[PDB]
């Protein structure tokens, strides 16, 4: 059994590894299949001390990942793509 204090501390608003769909972050890249199609980014998550508050980023940074692009019938190659990470989270009202 997980004890109250530990559940509360682990679930409170903080950056957590989050699998983000690449097309969602790059909606202009319309004709590609991406491999992998999602990347693991540090994004805000978890809960706040009461329902009026929501968890939101306050400090951000970028991470560069090599991603394969495939236009079917045309070509295939890898290159670098940059993604937004969350470094610090704050509970703020909605």
């Amino acid at each position, epitope marked *: 059994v997980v004890k109250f204090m530990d559940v509360y501390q682990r679930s409170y608003c903080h950056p957590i590894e989050t699998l983000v769909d690449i097309f969602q972050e790059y909606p202009d890249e319309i004709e590609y299949i991406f491999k992998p199609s999602c990347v693991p980014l540090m994004r805000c998550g978890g809960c706040c001390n009461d329902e009026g508050l929501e968890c939101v980023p306050t400090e951000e940074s970028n991470i560069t990942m090599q991603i*394969m692009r495939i236009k079917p019938h*045309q*070509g*295939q*190659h*890898i*290159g670098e793509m940059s993604f937004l990470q969350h470094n610090k989270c704050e509970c703020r009202p909605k």
Partner: antibody
Amino acid sequence: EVQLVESGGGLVQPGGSLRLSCAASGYDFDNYGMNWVRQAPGKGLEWVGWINTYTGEPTYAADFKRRFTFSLDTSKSTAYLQMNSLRAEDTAVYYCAKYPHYYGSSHWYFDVWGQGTLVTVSS
Amino acid sequence: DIQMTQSPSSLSASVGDRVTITCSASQDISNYLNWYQQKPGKAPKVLIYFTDDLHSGVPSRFSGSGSGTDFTLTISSLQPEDFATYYCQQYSTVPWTFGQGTKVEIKR
């Protein structure tokens, strides 16, 4: 240093068959699509097709579907082009060429080429 | 199949001359056009992709322009080593196709 080294060319008889190979080094073979291009002596350039080095999926220019086959050996980082029912108009230098690293968006030019091997169709 | 047609087919110019090579496409290819240089006994070498993006390592005296069906490669100051055959290539639709080539000779 990225290099493609080709081999397998030489004499083959009209109606016969042979297999060319393209051995890649200096980069991860699976990450870049491999193209095949040919040039008949003193003439222009002709794109044969390309093969996806990650899945093995080939794509042929239509005029070459019936007599040309692409294949991979990824553990040897080699691509192969097999040709049969050869005619005299198939006499040419056959190149392989990898696609480039991308920056921002995909442009399908040929980045690094093999040195080419001449195939001569003659009995 | 998209037909690419270059002109002229060959030309002679002196060291220092501005040289111009055009390429017409049988149908609109937007800006999906590259330029290669091929020297005797060698594989072609890409000079320019995406109409006008200069490949790294390529002198800046080469440049490209155009759109739709008309495209141009310019050598703003022909150098002796620019002797070669120059080819354009469309990547708008498969199969990829090439122009017939333009031979560039240096006059001296």
